[PDB]
Amino acid sequence: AFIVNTNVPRASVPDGFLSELTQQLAQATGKPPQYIAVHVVPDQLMAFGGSSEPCALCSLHSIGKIGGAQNRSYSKLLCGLLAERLRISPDRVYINYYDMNAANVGWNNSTFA
Amino acid sequence: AFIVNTNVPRASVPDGFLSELTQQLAQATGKPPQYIAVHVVPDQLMAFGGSSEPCALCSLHSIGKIGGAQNRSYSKLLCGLLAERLRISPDRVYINYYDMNAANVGWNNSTFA
Amino acid sequence: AFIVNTNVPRASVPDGFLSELTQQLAQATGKPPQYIAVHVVPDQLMAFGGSSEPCALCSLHSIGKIGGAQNRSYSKLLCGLLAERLRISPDRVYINYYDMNAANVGWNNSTFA
Known part of the structure; x- marks a missing residue:
């Protein structure tokens, strides 16, 4: 999932x-x-x-x-989109990336493991 | 902690x-x-x-x-509650699980370490 | 980044x-x-x-x-601020600490790696 929190x-x-x-x-x-x-x-x-x-x-x-x-x-892409669409300067964006283990992601009553 | 973000x-x-x-x-x-x-x-x-x-x-x-x-x-439990209470289909739910180190959880002016 | 979610x-x-x-x-x-x-x-x-x-x-x-x-x-500092400014008891605060790899933090069209 991708989440954006913004004051816009x-x-x-x-x-x-x-x-x-x-x-x-x-x-x-x-x-x-x-x-x-x-x-x-x-x-x-x-x-x-x-x-x-x-x-x-x-x-x-x-x-x-x-x-x-x-x-x-991804950072180039997503900063680009935030700048074009929401008018947020790329140097005012942080994005944290998380490589999730399939066993630690639940979905559809189970996990992806 | 358990957090649910939903469009419901x-x-x-x-x-x-x-x-x-x-x-x-x-x-x-x-x-x-x-x-x-x-x-x-x-x-x-x-x-x-x-x-x-x-x-x-x-x-x-x-x-x-x-x-x-x-x-x-946990996923079976939590998808079941979301489906019953919020009418969200289990295949439209992601849950990320995080095993936190006690030194990385603050509480009551200190950590659990 | 520091994020606080509260019912205050x-x-x-x-x-x-x-x-x-x-x-x-x-x-x-x-x-x-x-x-x-x-x-x-x-x-x-x-x-x-x-x-x-x-x-x-x-x-x-x-x-x-x-x-x-x-x-x-950090916990003493942050619990103290939440207690003084938001009137939240320190034993009703959890803070999760995350040590991010520089390669997993995007900023200004790139990452910190």
Whole structure:
């Protein structure tokens, strides 16, 4: 799943943003879009560097598809999207990447193990 | 702690839901309910598989009590509650499990180490 | 980043709270305040020990500066702030500490690796 928490207001999140994230992450990770879950949380009380200018804190959790070169590529993609769509400067974005073990991901009454 | 983020609206979360999560997680983990913390976040902007049908993204963090068989059992329990109480299909739920080191959990001005 | 989720209402969060967090975390971790990100989420549906008295579930993610003694010191600091500013008892606070690999933190179109 990909989560974005931001102080940008809800009205500034364009219609279609969750779909675009879904599509671009499917493409970037090489996973079918049926597996991709996205969550956007606007209107947050947040600061970055002490400033309340637009910012984002995000997380990308994946079973595999995480690593040094991949995460550089995801960061370019996702900063690009946040800059274009939400008008958040890339230097005011953090994204934490998490390589999840299949045994530690529940789904459909079981886990992926 | 157990956290559930969902697009299901607040009005659809039944009375008693946090209490029932607390009780059933105490029972499933074998921990006294005094230790259990629960957090439910409805009304979220979320998609799963590109669809906005009811879904959930959840986390369970625990100092121990995490593992292959345990996490399957937690998933059956928790998907069952989400399906019964919130009408979320089990195949539209992800739960990330985290086995926390006691030195990495703060509480009461210190950590559990 | 430091994130606090609480059932305390927004009106009970004092002016200056994000800034005081930012200043005190910079001091505690050594890190320049320009890189510190903070996020406060009030008005949450949460329970701790089955009770809805004020409580908080927090996360602190850092590239390094995490460890047994450091996390104890962060907990004293952060519990003290939550007690003084939000009137939350320290024994109703959990803080999860995460030592992030630089390759798993995206910022400014790249990662910190």
